[PDB]
């Protein structure tokens, strides 16, 4: 089996942890406990191949921006998350993409843009704007809901496929 190191980044509160735990335990976390640094392991078969996913859940709170570079060097793929009812989180995406590009010193890093919280009806970011940004980066855009599981497997597994073909 092949191992893949995925990293989930994005502004605080977008649902990086909820997406991760929904994928790992099929459970939705309603509590909001700010992450410092957490890692998860998951054995799964993707496109007929068995693989071991190592998922690093990062801190969104800017009061930990110093540790960032530390996890981007080891990561092979990145899930860049923002919430569709939070314009500032969407605007923070640009910064995460640039840090990753800088650290790993590459303009071809495997990543997926994820618009989380698609179960909520108070949308402030249109699918089209996120889609345009994704195209400008040459990556796919996947909308999800850690609450309903909608699009969750798709986001993580698409990221795995990008690392595999990269």
């Amino acid at each position: 089996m092949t191992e893949y190191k995925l990293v989930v980044v994005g502004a605080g509160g977008v649902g990086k942890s909820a997406l991760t735990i929904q994928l790992i335990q099929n459970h939705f976390v309603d509590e909001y406990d700010p992450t410092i640094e957490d890692s998860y392991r998951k054995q799964v078969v993707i496109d007929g191949e068995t693989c071991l996913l190592d998922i690093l859940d990062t801190a969104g709170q800017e009061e930990a921006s110093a540790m960032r570079d530390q996890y981007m060097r080891t990561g092979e793929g990145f899930l860049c998350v923002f919430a569709i009812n939070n314009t500032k989180s969407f605007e923070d995406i640009h910064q995460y993409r640039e840090q990753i590009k800088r650290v790993k010193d590459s303009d071809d890093v495997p990543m997926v843009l994820v618009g989380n919280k698609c179960d909520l009806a108070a949308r402030t970011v249109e699918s089209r704007q996120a889609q345009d940004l994704a195209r400008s980066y040459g990556i796919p855009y996947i909308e999800t809901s850690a609450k309903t599981r909608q699009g969750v497997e798709d986001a993580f597994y698409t990221l795995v496929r990008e690392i595999r073909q990269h």
Partner: protein
């Protein structure tokens, strides 16, 4: 570079040496070290390693007491800030504000990451190893007081969080699925008629499913504390490894029930139907990746009372003999095929816990607790990383839940199975073997005939699910 605090005011500033830390020959991997160095690395400012926190929190009790660990991390957290540099002093001395370039860098690249990491240890400690706090009231009071003394807005988010987590642990998990669970299947016994439940009256598909739910929950309830230190093998095992023992006892009980169902069915033709049904249950276990279930059947088929029933196995259809043989091959050559199979499936699954127990036990007694270097006695951390690697594998398979509906009455039926009755092990074991001799005497004694005991059709409904609801 960046000047660290004086080693005379902060113990975690002593430089690394062959006397206090050893690395393995791409973050550094610690082979051995003093408790002080282990804690420094546990909360290092340069790189991340969430793998280290779990390993440490899971195994530290053999080389460090809880109270002492708390003292050391609080001491780690209290980092003294550096004195103003020459440029700062010159500014202060002229009545203006210092740029404090170095102080700000030190807070950003050393203090903050170290303090956040200390807090991370505290959160995980309380979150997943609360028993330390349950067993020591003062330990909890000290943690609550430490967390409550932390000042500064650069920590308030995490302080508030941990305080709430601690209170939730003192006061006292829904599951969402992609698809919907398959419809419960019934055979001869109908819903609500628990009195007719038995091996051949319940649907084989539902027997395998309900037992898999049962066995999955037992597996998922085993905590690392029940494994570390090889406590399940010591005199206090019933106290220290209750969930592990509940799981093993269930497996044993089910294996004996299969053996009993077979040898107590004296009529050859009916016994063949019983063996055949059990192999079909095995087939469903394999489809569900319930390896524990698969092995309970294999152990039953390979027990002394059953293994010797040549006349019975001669009538089992060839396709089923192959199924049983493939299952048996998983255990051969020290489970080589099983290990390969487990690493290749798509969970959910229910692993065989036996393998893990043997590996933990050997790792624990095949490695020294400390490594000596220049007279110095260092904590052998590699031994701990190995035990934690095993407990980590176990936990990885404990995450995925099964998408199957529980059937209260069938579950109850299997929870109350008691093949041994009030008889002791030796007596029951001998009873089964004597029954085997009765139904299929040793050669050259002739094979006798026995009357049928079942009043309902013995034809199996098969193991292919039906799709109506």
């Amino acid at each position: 570079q960046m000047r660290l605090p004086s080693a005379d005011v902060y113990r975690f500033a002593e430089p690394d040496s062959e006397e206090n830390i050893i690395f393995e020959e791409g973050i550094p991997i610690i082979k051995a070290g003093t408790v002080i160095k282990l804690i420094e690395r546990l909360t290092y400012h340069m790189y991340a390693d969430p793998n280290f926190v779990r390993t440490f929190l899971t195994t530290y009790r053999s080389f460090c007491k809880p109270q002492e660990l708390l003292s050391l991390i609080i001491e780690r957290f209290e980092i003294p800030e550096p004195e103003p540099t020459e440029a700062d002093r010159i500014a202060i001395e002229n009545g203006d504000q210092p740029l404090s370039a170095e102080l700000k860098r030190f807070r950003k690249e050393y203090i903050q990451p170290v303090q956040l990491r200390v807090l991370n240890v505290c959160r995980h400690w309380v979150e997943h190893h609360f028993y330390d706090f349950e067993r020591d009231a003062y330990l909890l009071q000290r943690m609550e007081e430490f967390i409550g003394t932390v000042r500064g807005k650069a920590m308030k988010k995490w302080v508030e969080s941990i305080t709430k987590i601690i209170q939730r642990k003192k006061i006292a998990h829904n599951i969402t699925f992609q698809s919907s669970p398959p419809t419960v299947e019934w055979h001869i016994s109908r819903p609500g008629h628990i009195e007719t439940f038995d091996l051949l009256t319940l649907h084989p598909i539902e027997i395998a499913r309900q037992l898999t739910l049962l066995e999955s929950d037992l597996y998922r309830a085993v905590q690392p504390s029940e494994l570390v230190g090889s406590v399940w093998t010591k005199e206090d095992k019933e106290i220290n490894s209750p969930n592990l023992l509940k799981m093993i006892r269930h497996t044993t009980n089910l294996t004996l029930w299969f053996e009993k169902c077979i040898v107590e069915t004296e009529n050859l033709e009916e016994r063949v139907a019983v063996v055949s049904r059990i192999i079909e249950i095995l087939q469903v276990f394999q489809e569900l990746n319930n390896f524990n279930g698969v092995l309970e059947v294999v152990s039953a088929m390979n027990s002394s009372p059953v293994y010797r029933l040549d006349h019975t196995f001669e009538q089992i259809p060839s396709r089923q003999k192959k199924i049983l043989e493939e299952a048996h091959e998983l255990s051969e050559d020290h489970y080589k095929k099983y290990l390969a199979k487990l690493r290749s499936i798509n969970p959910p699954c229910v692993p065989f816990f036996g393998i893990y127990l043997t590996n933990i036990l050997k790792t624990e007694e095949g490695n020294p607790e400390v490594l000596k270097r220049h007279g110095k006695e260092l904590i052998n951390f590699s031994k701990r990383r190995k035990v934690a690697e095993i407990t980590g594998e176990i936990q990885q398979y404990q995450n995925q839940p099964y998408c199957l509906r529980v059937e209260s009455d069938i579950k109850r039926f299997f929870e109350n199975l008691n093949p041994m009755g009030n008889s002791m092990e030796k007596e029951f074991t001998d009873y089964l073997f004597n029954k085997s001799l009765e139904i299929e005497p040793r050669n050259p004694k002739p094979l006798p005939r026995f009357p049928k005991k079942y009043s309902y059709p013995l034809k199996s409904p098969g193991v292919r699910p039906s799709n109506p609801r």
